[PDB]
Amino acid sequence: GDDRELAILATAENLLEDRPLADISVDDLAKGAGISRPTFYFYFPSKEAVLLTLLDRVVNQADMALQTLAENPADTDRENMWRTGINVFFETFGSHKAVTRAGQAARATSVEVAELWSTFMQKWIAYTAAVIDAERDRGAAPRTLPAHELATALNLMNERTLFASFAGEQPSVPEARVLDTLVHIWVTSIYGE
Amino acid sequence: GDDRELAILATAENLLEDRPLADISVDDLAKGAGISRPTFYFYFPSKEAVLLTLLDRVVNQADMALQTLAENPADTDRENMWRTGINVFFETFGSHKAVTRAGQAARATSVEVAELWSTFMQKWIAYTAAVIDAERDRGAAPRTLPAHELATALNLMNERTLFASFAGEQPSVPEARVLDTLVHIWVTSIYGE
Ligand SMILES: CC1CCN(C(=O)N[C@H](C)c2ccccc2)CC1
Ligand SMILES: CC1CCN(C(=O)N[C@H](C)c2ccccc2)CC1
Structure with missing residues (x-):
């Protein structure tokens, strides 16, 4: 719950060190957080x-x-x-x-x-x-x-x-x-x- | 020549007072400068x-x-x-x-x-x-x-x-x-x- 949310946040912060938001996909954030794309959209709209x-x-x-x-x-x-x-x-x-x-x-x-x-x-x-x-x-x-x-x-x-x-x-x-x-x-x- | 170029510049400056670049088209700049779209592209690539x-x-x-x-x-x-x-x-x-x-x-x-x-x-x-x-x-x-x-x-x-x-x-x-x-x-x- 809060753990998947925190994992998505950590993944996003980690990925923003190497590239901009435009070059990061929801599939990238889901993958990094160990969740599916629809599961991502449960935690965040975008x-x-x-x-x-x-x-x-x-x-x-x-x-x-x-x-x-x-x-x-x-x-x-x-x-x-x-x-x-x-x-x-x-x-x-x-x-x-x-x-x-x-x-x-x-x-x-x-x-x-x-x-x-x-x-x-x-x-x-x-x-x-x-x-x-x-x-x-x-x-x-x-x-x-x-x-x-x-x-x-x-x-x-x-x-x-x-x-x-x-x-x-x-x-x-x-x-x-x-x-x-x-x-x-x-x-x-x-x-x- | 320099007159069409200057007209395109004046049009662009005038249009940027009312809206951002994203909301301005080359057709808008051409129209405002009294030229066609291909003529525009002779003066400026974008x-x-x-x-x-x-x-x-x-x-x-x-x-x-x-x-x-x-x-x-x-x-x-x-x-x-x-x-x-x-x-x-x-x-x-x-x-x-x-x-x-x-x-x-x-x-x-x-x-x-x-x-x-x-x-x-x-x-x-x-x-x-x-x-x-x-x-x-x-x-x-x-x-x-x-x-x-x-x-x-x-x-x-x-x-x-x-x-x-x-x-x-x-x-x-x-x-x-x-x-x-x-x-x-x-x-x-x-x-x-
Ligand atoms: C007592 C003051 C100390 C100095 N302050 C300060 O630098 N604020 C600026 C706006 C700032 C904020 C976030 C990141 C970068 C800069 C405000 C508060
Ligand atoms: C003797 C100095 C006077 C003050 N200066 C100055 O404000 N420069 C800043 C960077 C600036 C430039 C364009 C637009 C807005 C701000 C530089 C030169």
Whole structure:
């Protein structure tokens, strides 16, 4: 039951490491999961729906990890606070590069993948903005740009820059330098006047 | 000759304002350009090739505008220098939103659109890095991050943030606030310690 479903998900994630969704068949997913094609269709309406679930799981893992941080402050300076938080996204999505890559491409063709991504981006921006506001309220950050607009650009930066590094795009920041690059831009743009 | 070619390009740009490339036919482009379908195929091998040329023209217009700036320094402070340069991209791509939107989507499916975009990104990053280096050499900017890695992230930020604003994505920075948002992040990240 949940075991066949999990096997289909594992197969799909494994197969997306070697080729795109377009080059993967339902027969490929069924075969890999040790089930027939009609049995597959009992668990999922389409290969597209398999990706959506994989992405949903990755996105929620990141979100849950950020919630955990938000509830248990690490005892460090402000630079390290931002780094720790950006690192949740670096590690979570960096641990699922094929799902990241396929899921970002699916945004063009799938309304549900677009809305999933859009919902969580709004959440992570809102949280970023709340932290900047608290930093301004405590007098640690200067009142420069509208917090929510600053939050939006920094989050979009992270999205495009992390994804380019993971995919090895040209151009991209090397994966071993991307965390420090983002953290510097967040800290200088948040604290700087 | 060049007139039929230009008419096909104009038709394609006009039609991309109302619908995507997938929903536009060669018969649509021929009709709009006042030519037959075989005559179309004399000028362009595909509707895809029409987009590639449109994007090529937009990209080169931006590039040429930046070259002009680079050769004639505006007499202002450093904030205004960056703003003027970011503004070339804001205005050029902002004046061709349908071509921008279609061309960015084509990156997934077209190797030539991917390589066009990649070539000019490398150029604009290299130029950004050269300016930061000169700023460091004159002692106006501190030696923080590797210039080229800083240049890469700021350019990727601009790409994703400008495009989200133009497309009205959720989330996005409002188009009337996006220039000031980017300029603040560039200036604080380039000059800040
Ligand atoms: C406290 C903040 C830390 C930094 N954040 C962050 O990088 N979000 C962006 C949008 C992202 C999300 C998933 C994958 C790649 C990038 C948000 C939350
Ligand atoms: C001096 C620099 C100014 C800012 N630049 C810039 O925004 N480039 C990015 C990559 C971009 C290009 C086209 C469309 C949207 C964004 C580069 C050059």
